[PDB]
């Protein structure tokens, strides 16, 4: 489920921004807990000076999904590790492909 290397747990939004800015590389990413909603996670990716945050969460059936723009088909994954792999590929709908994992 959520035993991935880039999962940092309960770190603050500002702490996440710091870790990513430190690498100085577009595409560096980490996963942390939402600062106020239980069961919701944030996939953070650095791109041109900003940290793009995508909200990730489970459904009743325990499948993971990233927040999608209105009109776009949602995509589900049983394991969060497969959601990450899917987004390491180009042209998948996010600002830039997940490339440099910032491990805990």
């Amino acid at each position: 489920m959520d035993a991935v290397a880039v999962y940092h747990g309960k770190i603050s939004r500002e702490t996440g921004e710091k870790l990513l800015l430190a690498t100085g590389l577009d595409g560096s990413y980490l996963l942390r807990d939402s600062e106020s909603v239980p069961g919701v996670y944030c996939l953070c990716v650095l791109y041109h000076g900003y940290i793009y945050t995508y909200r990730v969460s489970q459904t009743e059936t325990g499948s993971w999904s990233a927040e999608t723009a209105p009109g776009v088909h949602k995509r589900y994954f049983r394991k969060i590790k497969n959601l990450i792999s899917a987004f390491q590929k180009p042209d998948q709908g996010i600002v830039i492909p997940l490339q440099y994992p910032v491990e805990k």
């Binding site: 940290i51 995508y54 990233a66 996010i94």
Partner: peptide, 11 residues
């Protein structure tokens, strides 16, 4: 003040 931008998947 904040470098965080809340994004959504586009495809």
């Amino acid at each position: 003040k904040s470098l965080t931008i809340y994004a959504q998947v586009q495809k």
